[PDB]
Homo-oligomer: 159 residues x 3
């Protein structure tokens, strides 16, 4: 699917994405919220907190807020490989789940595949936020045990 | 056992428990300190740190510092299910362990069971702090491998 | 091998080692850099950052910057057992890796064993940074699953 652009202004780089990056991993997240990707992104590029992610994906679209080759602060691991080498994808509507979320998860499969192809990132380098810092994210994918299936679709699904 | 109330004042909600909450999980901690519940709570409800927990439990009593239906900042998972959907129970005297701590842990079984019954929280929703953010808490229960037995006690009594 | 004592001046202890410590655990890290043990330590002692580790090791030498019997902030567990009860050992060249790092790791096994027999720290008390805070460290070791073999080398020699 087409990944919509809505990057943060270069003037906030020092706050949202100060460092350049050579993508080597893709980190999947759940927002633990029920807001659309546009809202999630818009908020992330407007507030002045050192919190960010590359792309938000909901049941309808994918919107990019941080240049792919600049780091984001979403893996909570300081300057570890999480925040300094991975591209973060945030799946919307996970708080309450429902068709909206499962639809957004399917779109996220698309996004991860494009990113893997785009930066030549292998399937084994597709990770959960939890693998980097220990935080329970993506909470819904973890609690429902959907990670394994998500991975196989990205890996060999014809979607 | 009775859970005494020594709640934070309303004016400090924005810092200690800014959000209403619908209990879905119970998170167990170890304070890594050798102070009684009254001290742990008195300190937590008075200082101005955005750090808090619902109830402290020692070898003698159980004291609640935050309303059960308001979040607490004890899971370090920011705005995740840990800090927004679980009630935090802290077991005292874990720092040195001993009888005082074991008695406190057993009392915690009862407190946890009371919370489960009160908000119909299944046994599978009784979690450790570590499961939410990775911190080594409850340190003593994890170190001495007492979590399994804990769950069983809570399951029966 | 021999560990130098490029220890930070006692005047900076208040930030690198402001707490007396009784060594009970050993935490192994991965610098996530391509700099030698000399520069790592020499750096960690210059800046007045609230970050520090006890000893760094590379394919060449092993250097100590923080007194063994004093705490060091490197496990990111606030004031928990990780930071207040363990000796942090940082292995260099984890970023790029290669012969340097691998040789640096074999050396680290020597440093660990020395610390153990010196402070009677049992093999089960040799942990990763990850076990304390959930952080992915030592990254390369974990990525390559070299930990299980590491603990075995510490046992033997
Ligand atoms: Zn996340
Ligand atoms: Zn805890
Ligand atoms: Zn580390």
């Amino acid at each position: 699917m087409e990944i919509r652009k809505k990057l943060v202004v270069p003037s906030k780089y020092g706050t949202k994405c100060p460092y350049t990056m050579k993508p080597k991993y893709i980190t999947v997240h759940n927002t633990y919220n029920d807001a659309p990707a546009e809202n999630e992104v818009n908020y992330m590029i407007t507030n002045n907190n050192e919190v960010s992610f590359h792309v938000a994906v909901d049941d309808k679209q994918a919107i990019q807020g941080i240049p792919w080759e600049r780091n984001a602060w979403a893996c909570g691991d300081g300057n570890g490989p999480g925040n300094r080498e991975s591209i973060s994808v945030a799946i919307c509507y996970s708080k309450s789940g429902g068709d909206r979320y499962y639809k957004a998860e399917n779109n996220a499969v698309d996004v991860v595949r494009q990113l893997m192809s785009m930066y030549n990132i292998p399937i084994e380098n597709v990770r959960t936020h939890q693998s980097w810092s220990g935080k329970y994210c993506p909470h819904r994918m973890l609690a429902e045990g959907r990670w394994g299936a998500f991975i196989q679709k990205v890996k060999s699904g014809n979607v």
